[PDB]
């Protein structure tokens, strides 16, 4: 029963059991009924914690691997790979949900959901790109950019520049350029213009959107400061 699964997802969150949380929301999505804004948030929060823990772990191991006896380096590499394979499975799960249900069921004028989900698609291809090498890397980098690009065009044409979802897209897209494409001028240009287009009308946002957008703007600023130094 659908509501039990969502209830479970909420319980898992409170218990900070994010693997459970994501598995519940995965099952909910596969019912092919649309997610409400709260359900969409549960999905997004769950998988971000699941993949986020692995990204964090992967970076620790990767760094150790770099700063370090065949059998010692062999264990480090294998452990890194173990973490990589998990990260890849999680991303594949999310990307399959997005392609087969979430993006698919957005109607022509559900712009916010389209931008939300295409962004998400951009994000999890970006997480794959973080650990990928070679031709597999080219593919996930290309897929990431395409999802970001399509979400960007929708957001520019059909959403206010102050909208948290549009701002959050610009934030992550600019991060893609900086970290994945190593294109610091492109990254800064996207970040700055997004910031600039929103900052004048910030006060026109409602209470909850103003909170969300302010935070994202601060991160845009923080990234610009960091990147231009």
């Amino acid at each position: 029963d659908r509501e039990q699964l969502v209830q479970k997802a909420r319980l898992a969150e409170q218990a900070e059991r994010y693997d459970d949380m994501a598995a519940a929301m995965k099952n909910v999505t596969e019912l092919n009924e649309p997610l409400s804004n709260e359900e969409r948030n549960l999905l997004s929060v769950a998988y971000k914690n699941v993949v986020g823990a692995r990204r964090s772990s992967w970076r620790v191991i990767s760094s150790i691997e770099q700063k370090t006896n065949e059998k010692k380096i062999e264990m480090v590499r294998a452990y890194r790979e173990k973490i990589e394979k998990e990260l890849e499975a999680v991303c594949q799960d999310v990307l399959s949900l997005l392609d087969n249900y979430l993006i698919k069921n957005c109607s022509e004028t559900q712009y916010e959901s389209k931008v939300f989900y295409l962004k998400m698609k951009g994000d999890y291809y970006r997480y794959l790109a973080e650990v990928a090498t070679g031709e597999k890397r080219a593919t996930v980098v290309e897929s990431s950019e395409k999802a970001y690009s399509e979400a960007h065009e929708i957001s520019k044409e059909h959403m206010q520049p102050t909208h948290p979802i549009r701002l959050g897209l610009a934030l992550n897209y600019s991060v893609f350029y900086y970290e994945i494409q190593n294109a610091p001028e492109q990254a800064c240009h996207l970040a700055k213009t997004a910031f600039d287009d929103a900052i004048a009308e910030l006060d026109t946002l409602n209470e909850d959107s103003y909170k969300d957008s302010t935070l994202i703007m601060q991160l845009l600023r923080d990234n610009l400061t960091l990147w231009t130094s």
């Binding site: 971000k48 994000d123 897209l169 959107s209 923080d222």
Partner: peptide, 11 residues
Amino acid sequence: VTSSSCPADLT
């Protein structure tokens, strides 16, 4: 040091 990305949730 690394770039900050978007929070997973909305209000």
